[PDB]
mmCIF file of C-alpha atoms in Angstrom:
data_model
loop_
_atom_site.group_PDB
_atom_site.id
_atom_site.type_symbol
_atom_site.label_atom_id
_atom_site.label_comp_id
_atom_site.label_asym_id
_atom_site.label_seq_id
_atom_site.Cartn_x
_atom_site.Cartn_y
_atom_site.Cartn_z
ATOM 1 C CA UNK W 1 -75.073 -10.757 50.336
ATOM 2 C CA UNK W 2 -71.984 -11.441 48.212
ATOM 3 C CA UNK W 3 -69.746 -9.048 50.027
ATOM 4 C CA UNK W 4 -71.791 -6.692 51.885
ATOM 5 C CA UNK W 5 -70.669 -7.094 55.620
ATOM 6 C CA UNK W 6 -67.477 -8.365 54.385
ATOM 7 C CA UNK W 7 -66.844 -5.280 51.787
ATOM 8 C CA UNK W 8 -68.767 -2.190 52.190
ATOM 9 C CA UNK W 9 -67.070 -0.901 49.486
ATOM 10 C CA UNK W 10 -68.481 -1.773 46.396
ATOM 11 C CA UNK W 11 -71.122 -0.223 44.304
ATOM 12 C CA UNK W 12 -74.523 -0.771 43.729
ATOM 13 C CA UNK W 13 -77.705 1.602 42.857
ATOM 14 C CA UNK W 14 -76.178 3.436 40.198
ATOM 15 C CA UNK W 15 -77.775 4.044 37.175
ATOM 16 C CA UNK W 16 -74.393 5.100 35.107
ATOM 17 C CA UNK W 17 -76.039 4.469 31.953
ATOM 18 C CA UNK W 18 -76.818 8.161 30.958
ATOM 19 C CA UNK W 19 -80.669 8.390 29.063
ATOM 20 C CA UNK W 20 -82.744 10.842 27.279
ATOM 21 C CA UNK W 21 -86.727 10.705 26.538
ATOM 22 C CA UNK W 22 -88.216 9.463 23.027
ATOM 23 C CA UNK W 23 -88.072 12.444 21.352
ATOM 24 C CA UNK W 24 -87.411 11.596 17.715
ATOM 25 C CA UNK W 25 -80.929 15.650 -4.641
ATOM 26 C CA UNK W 26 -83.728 15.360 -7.630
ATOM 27 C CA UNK W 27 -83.684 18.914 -9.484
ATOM 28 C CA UNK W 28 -84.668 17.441 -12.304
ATOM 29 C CA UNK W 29 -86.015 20.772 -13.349
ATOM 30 C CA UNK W 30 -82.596 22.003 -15.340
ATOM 31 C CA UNK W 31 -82.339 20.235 -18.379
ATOM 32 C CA UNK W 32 -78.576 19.601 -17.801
ATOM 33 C CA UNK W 33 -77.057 15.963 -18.573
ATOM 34 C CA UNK W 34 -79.594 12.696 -19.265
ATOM 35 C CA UNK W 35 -79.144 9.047 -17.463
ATOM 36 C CA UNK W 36 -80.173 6.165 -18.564
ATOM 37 C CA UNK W 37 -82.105 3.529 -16.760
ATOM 38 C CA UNK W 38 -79.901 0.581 -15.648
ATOM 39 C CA UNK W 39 -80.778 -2.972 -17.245
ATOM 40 C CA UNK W 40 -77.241 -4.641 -17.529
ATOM 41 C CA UNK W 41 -79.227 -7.442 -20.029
ATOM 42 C CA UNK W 42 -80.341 -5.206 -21.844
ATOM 43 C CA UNK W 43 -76.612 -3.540 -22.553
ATOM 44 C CA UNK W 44 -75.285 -6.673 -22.273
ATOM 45 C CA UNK W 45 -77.763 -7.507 -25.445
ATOM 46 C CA UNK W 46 -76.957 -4.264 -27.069
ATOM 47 C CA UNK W 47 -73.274 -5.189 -26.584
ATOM 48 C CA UNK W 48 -73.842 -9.084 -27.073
ATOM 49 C CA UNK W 49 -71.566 -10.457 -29.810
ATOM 50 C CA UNK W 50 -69.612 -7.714 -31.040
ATOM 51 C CA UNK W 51 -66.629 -10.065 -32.524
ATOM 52 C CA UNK W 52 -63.449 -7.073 -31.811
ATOM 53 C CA UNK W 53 -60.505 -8.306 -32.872
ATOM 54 C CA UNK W 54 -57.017 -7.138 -31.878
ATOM 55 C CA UNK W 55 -54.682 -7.654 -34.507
ATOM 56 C CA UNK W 56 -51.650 -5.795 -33.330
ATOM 57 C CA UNK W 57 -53.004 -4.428 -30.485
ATOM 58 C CA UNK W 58 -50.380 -1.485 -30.112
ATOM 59 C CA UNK W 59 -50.841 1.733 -28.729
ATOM 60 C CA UNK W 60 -47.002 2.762 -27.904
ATOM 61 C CA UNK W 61 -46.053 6.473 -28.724
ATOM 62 C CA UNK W 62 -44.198 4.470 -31.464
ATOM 63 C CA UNK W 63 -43.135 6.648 -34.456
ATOM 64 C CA UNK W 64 -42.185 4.147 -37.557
ATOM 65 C CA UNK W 65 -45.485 4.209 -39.335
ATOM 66 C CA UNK W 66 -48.778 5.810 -40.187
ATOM 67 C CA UNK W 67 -51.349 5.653 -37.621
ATOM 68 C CA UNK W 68 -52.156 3.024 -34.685
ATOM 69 C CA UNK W 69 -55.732 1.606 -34.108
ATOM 70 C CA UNK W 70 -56.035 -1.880 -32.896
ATOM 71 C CA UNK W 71 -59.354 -3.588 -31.886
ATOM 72 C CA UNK W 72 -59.770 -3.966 -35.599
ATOM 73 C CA UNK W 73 -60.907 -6.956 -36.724
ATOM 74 C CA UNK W 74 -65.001 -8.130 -36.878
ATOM 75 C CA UNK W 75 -66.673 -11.311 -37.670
ATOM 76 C CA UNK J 1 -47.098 24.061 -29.462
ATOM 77 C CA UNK J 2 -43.875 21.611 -29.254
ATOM 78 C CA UNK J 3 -43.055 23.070 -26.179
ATOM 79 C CA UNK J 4 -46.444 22.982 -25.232
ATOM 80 C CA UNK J 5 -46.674 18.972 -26.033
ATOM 81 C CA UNK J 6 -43.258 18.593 -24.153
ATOM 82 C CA UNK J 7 -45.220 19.874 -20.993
ATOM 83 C CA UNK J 8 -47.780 16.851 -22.216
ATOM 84 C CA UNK J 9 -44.702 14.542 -21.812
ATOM 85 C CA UNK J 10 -43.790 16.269 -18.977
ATOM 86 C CA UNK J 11 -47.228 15.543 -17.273
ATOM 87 C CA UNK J 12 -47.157 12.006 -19.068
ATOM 88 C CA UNK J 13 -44.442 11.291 -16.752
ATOM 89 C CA UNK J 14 -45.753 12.978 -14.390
ATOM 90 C CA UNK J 15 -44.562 17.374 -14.851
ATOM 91 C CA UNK J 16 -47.677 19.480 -14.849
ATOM 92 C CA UNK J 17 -47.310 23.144 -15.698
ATOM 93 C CA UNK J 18 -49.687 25.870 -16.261
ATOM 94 C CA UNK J 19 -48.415 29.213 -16.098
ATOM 95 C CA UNK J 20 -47.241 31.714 -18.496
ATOM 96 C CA UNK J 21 -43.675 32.279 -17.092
ATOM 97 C CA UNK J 22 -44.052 28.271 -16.297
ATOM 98 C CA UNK J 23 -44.571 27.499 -20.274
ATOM 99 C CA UNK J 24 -41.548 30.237 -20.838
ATOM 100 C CA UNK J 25 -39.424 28.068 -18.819
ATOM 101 C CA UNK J 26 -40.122 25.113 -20.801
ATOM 102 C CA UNK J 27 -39.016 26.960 -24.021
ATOM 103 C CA UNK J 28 -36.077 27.763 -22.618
ATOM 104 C CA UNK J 29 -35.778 23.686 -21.620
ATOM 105 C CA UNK J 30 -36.660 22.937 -25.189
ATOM 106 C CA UNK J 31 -34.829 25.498 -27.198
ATOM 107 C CA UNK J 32 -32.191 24.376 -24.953
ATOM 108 C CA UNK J 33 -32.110 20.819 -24.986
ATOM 109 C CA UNK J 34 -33.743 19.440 -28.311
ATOM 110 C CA UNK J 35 -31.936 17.739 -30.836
ATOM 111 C CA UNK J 36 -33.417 15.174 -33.704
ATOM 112 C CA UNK J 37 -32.284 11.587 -33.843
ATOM 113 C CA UNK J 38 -31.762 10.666 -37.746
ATOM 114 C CA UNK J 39 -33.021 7.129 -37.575
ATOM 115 C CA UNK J 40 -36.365 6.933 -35.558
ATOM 116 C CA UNK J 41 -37.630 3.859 -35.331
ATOM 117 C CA UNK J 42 -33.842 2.637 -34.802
ATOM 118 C CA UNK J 43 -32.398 4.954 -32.152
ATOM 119 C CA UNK J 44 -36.004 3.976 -30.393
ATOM 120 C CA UNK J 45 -35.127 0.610 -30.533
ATOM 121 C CA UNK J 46 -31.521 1.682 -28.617
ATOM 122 C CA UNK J 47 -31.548 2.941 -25.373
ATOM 123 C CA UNK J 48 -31.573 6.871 -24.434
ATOM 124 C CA UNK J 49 -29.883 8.505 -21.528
ATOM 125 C CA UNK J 50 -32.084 10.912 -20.147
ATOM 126 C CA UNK J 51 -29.649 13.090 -18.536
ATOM 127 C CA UNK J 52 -31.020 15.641 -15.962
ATOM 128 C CA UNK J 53 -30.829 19.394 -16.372
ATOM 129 C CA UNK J 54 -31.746 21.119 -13.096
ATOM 130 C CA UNK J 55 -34.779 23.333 -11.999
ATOM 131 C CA UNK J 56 -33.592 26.888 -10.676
ATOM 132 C CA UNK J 57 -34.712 25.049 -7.346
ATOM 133 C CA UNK J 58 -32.520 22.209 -8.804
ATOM 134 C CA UNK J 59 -34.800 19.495 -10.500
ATOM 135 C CA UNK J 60 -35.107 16.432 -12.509
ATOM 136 C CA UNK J 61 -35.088 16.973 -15.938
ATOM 137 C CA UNK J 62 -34.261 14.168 -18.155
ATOM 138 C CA UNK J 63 -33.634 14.227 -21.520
ATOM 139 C CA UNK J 64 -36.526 10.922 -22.467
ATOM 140 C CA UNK J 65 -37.609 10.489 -25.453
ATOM 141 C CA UNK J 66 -39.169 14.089 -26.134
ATOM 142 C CA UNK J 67 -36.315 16.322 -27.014
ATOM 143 C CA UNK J 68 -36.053 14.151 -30.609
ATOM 144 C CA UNK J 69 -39.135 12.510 -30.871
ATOM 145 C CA UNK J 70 -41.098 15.900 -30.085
ATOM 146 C CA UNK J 71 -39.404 17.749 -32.946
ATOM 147 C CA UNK J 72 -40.248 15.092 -35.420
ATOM 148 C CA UNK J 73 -44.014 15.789 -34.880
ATOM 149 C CA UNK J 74 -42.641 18.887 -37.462
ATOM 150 C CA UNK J 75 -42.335 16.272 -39.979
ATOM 151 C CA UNK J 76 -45.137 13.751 -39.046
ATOM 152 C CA UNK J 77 -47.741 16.459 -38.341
ATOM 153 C CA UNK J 78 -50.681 14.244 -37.866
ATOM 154 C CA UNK J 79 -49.402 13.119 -34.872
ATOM 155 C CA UNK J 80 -50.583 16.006 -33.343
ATOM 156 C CA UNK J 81 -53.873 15.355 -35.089
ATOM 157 C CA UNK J 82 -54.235 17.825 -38.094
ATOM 158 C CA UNK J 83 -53.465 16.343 -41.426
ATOM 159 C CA UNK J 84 -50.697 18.550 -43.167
ATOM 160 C CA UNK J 85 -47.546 17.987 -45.580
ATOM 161 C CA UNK J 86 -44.310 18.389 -43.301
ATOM 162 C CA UNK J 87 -41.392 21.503 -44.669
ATOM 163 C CA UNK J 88 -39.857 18.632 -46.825
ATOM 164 C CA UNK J 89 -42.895 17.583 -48.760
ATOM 165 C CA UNK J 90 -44.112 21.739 -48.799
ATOM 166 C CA UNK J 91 -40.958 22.304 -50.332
ATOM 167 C CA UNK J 92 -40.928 19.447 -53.220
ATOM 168 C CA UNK J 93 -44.760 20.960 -54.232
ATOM 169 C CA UNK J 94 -43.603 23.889 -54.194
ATOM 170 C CA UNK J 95 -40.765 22.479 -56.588
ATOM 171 C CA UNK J 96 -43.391 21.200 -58.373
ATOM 172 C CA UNK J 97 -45.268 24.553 -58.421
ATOM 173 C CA UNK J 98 -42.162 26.362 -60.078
ATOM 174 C CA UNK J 99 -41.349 25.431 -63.469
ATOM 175 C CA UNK J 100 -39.177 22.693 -65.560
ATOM 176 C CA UNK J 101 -36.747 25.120 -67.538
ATOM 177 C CA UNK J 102 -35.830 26.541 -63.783
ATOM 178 C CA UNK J 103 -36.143 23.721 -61.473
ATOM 179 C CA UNK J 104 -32.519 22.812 -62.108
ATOM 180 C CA UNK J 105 -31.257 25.893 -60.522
ATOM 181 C CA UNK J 106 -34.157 25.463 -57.618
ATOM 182 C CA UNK J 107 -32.658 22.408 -56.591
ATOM 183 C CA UNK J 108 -29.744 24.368 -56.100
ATOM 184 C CA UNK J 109 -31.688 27.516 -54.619
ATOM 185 C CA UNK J 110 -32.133 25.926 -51.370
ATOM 186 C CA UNK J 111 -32.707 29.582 -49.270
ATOM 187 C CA UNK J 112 -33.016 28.485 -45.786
ATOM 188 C CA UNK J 113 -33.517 30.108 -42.686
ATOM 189 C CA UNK J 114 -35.706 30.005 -39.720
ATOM 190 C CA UNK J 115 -34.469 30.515 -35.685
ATOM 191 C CA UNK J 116 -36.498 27.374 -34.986
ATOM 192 C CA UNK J 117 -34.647 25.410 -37.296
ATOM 193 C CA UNK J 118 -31.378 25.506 -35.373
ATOM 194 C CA UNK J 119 -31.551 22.113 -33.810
ATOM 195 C CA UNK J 120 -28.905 18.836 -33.804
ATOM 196 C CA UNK J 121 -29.539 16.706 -36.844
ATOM 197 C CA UNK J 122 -31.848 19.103 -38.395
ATOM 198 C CA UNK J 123 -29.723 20.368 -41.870
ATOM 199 C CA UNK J 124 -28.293 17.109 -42.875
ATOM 200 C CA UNK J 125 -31.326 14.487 -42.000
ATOM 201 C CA UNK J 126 -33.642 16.966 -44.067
ATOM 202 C CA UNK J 127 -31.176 16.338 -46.462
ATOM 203 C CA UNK J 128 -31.841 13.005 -46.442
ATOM 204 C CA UNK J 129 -35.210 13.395 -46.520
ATOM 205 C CA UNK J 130 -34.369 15.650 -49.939
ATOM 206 C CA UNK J 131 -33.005 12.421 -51.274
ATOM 207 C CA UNK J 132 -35.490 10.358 -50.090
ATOM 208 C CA UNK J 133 -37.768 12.793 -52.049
ATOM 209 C CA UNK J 134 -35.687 14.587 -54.508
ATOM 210 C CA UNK J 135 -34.362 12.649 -57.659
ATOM 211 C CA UNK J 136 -30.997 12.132 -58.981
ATOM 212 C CA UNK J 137 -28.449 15.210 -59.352
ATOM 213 C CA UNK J 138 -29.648 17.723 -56.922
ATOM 214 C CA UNK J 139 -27.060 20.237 -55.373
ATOM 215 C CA UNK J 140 -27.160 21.233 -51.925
ATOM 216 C CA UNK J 141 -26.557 24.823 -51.245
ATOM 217 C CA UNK J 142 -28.276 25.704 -47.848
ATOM 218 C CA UNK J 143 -27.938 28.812 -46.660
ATOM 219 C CA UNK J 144 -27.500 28.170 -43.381
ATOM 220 C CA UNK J 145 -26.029 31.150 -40.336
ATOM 221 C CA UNK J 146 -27.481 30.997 -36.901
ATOM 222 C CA UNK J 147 -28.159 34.505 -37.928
ATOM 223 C CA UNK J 148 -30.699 34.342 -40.109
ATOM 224 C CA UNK J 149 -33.015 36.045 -38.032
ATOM 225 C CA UNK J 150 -30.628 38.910 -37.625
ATOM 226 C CA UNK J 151 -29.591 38.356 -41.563
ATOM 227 C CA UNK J 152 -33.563 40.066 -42.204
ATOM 228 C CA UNK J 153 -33.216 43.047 -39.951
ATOM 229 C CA UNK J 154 -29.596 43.509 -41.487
ATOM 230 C CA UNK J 155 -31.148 43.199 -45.187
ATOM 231 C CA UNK J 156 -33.675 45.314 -44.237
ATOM 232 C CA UNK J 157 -31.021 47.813 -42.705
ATOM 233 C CA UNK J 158 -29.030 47.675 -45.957
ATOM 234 C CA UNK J 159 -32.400 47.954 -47.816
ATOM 235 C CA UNK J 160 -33.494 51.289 -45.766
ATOM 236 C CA UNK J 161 -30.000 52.568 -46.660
ATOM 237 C CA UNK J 162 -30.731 52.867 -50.884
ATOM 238 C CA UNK J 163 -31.733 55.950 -53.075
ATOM 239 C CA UNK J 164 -34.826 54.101 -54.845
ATOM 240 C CA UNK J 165 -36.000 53.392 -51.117
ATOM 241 C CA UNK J 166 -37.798 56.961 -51.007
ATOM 242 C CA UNK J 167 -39.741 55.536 -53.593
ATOM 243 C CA UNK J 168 -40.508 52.165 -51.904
ATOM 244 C CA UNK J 169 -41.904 53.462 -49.168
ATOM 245 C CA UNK J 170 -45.300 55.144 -48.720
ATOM 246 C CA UNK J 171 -45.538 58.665 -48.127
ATOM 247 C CA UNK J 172 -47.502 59.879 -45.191
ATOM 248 C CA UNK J 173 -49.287 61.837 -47.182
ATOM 249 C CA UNK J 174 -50.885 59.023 -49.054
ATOM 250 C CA UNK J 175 -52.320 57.885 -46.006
ATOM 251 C CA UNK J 176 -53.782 61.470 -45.903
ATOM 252 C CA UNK J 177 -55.195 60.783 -49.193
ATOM 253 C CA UNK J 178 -56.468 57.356 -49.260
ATOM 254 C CA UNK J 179 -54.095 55.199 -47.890
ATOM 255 C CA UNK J 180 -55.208 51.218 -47.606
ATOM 256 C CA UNK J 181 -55.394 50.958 -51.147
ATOM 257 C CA UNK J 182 -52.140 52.523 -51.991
ATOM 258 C CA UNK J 183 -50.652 50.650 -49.083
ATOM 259 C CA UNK J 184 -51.160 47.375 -51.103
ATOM 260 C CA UNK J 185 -50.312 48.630 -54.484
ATOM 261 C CA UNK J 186 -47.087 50.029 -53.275
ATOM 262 C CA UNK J 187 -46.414 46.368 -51.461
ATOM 263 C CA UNK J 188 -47.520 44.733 -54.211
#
């Protein structure tokens, strides 16, 4: 009896909760594009000391020479 | 294809356009604002002004670095990826493909003409490119009217009006005959 003579007011029984009852891609047959089976080491030892160089690394939409291509230099 | 690699700066700077009447209006914004800056490298170095011209809604257009830098892809054709010669150095081999005892007067024959052609600093840089190429004692003598398009369908007016013009032509007739054949011996 926390309040029940004192305040008949106040809920109780009520089941507001509202149930229910336990009632509970991979066309790889085109021939389309190829993936390749992830193995970062593996890449990263494909790609492992490739010495790229940068010498004039510039790329601009300059117009005072031939050609740009930097990443240029190896080992 | 200039006009087609303005749209690219257009979209580089963020102008995409796809549409036929779309591309036309972009000729008309090249043919109407292009020019070529004699000293690349230099007037790059300066800065532009990129003035706007106005959409028929009422748009941004500035002038950036395309309406000069663009043209110059005439003259530096691999730019555009395709290895060629550029008007200047076509013209010198053909210089070199006409003869010694006439060359003299070829450096004066200097026939131009071409609608395209009639941008800003187009005549006189190519001349300096002539002297960049050309050796010592060449005379310039460009023929050079706005009208030079017009100047073919006149001389080709003046040309229908002649008496040895019944002659030039091909008869109908032929064509009755055999035709093809005849067609290219009379052009030729």
């Amino acid at each position: 009896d926390p309040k029940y003579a004192d305040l008949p007011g106040i809920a109780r029984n009520e089941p507001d909760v509202y149930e229910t009852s336990d009632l509970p891609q991979e066309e790889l047959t085109s021939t389309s594009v190829e993936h390749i089976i992830v193995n970062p080491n593996a890449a990263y030892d494909k790609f492992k000391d490739k010495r790229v160089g940068t010498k004039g690394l510039d790329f601009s939409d300059r117009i005072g020479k031939t050609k740009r291509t930097g990443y240029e230099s190896g080992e | 294809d200039v006009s087609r690699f303005l749209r690219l700066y257009l979209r580089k700077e963020g102008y995409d356009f796809h549409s036929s009447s779309e591309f036309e209006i972009v000729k008309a914004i090249k043919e109407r604002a292009c020019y070529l800056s004699i000293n690349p490298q230099k007037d790059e170095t300066l800065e532009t002004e990129k003035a706007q011209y106005y959409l028929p809604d009422g748009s941004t257009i500035e002038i950036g670095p395309s309406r000069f830098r663009a043209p110059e892809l005439l003259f530096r054709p691999d730019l555009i990826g395709e290895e060629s010669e550029g008007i200047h150095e076509v013209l010198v081999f053909a210089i070199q493909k006409s003869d010694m005892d006439l060359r003299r007067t070829l450096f004066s024959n200097i026939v131009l003409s071409g609608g395209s052609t009639l941008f800003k600093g187009f005549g006189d840089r190519l001349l300096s490119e002539v002297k960049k190429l050309a050796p010592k004692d060449v005379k310039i003598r460009i023929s050079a009217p706005q009208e030079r398009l017009y100047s073919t369908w006149i001389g080709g007016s003046i040309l229908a009006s002649l008496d040895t013009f019944k002659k030039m032509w091909v008869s109908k007739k032929e064509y009755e005959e055999d035709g093809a054949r005849s067609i290219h011996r009379k052009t030729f």
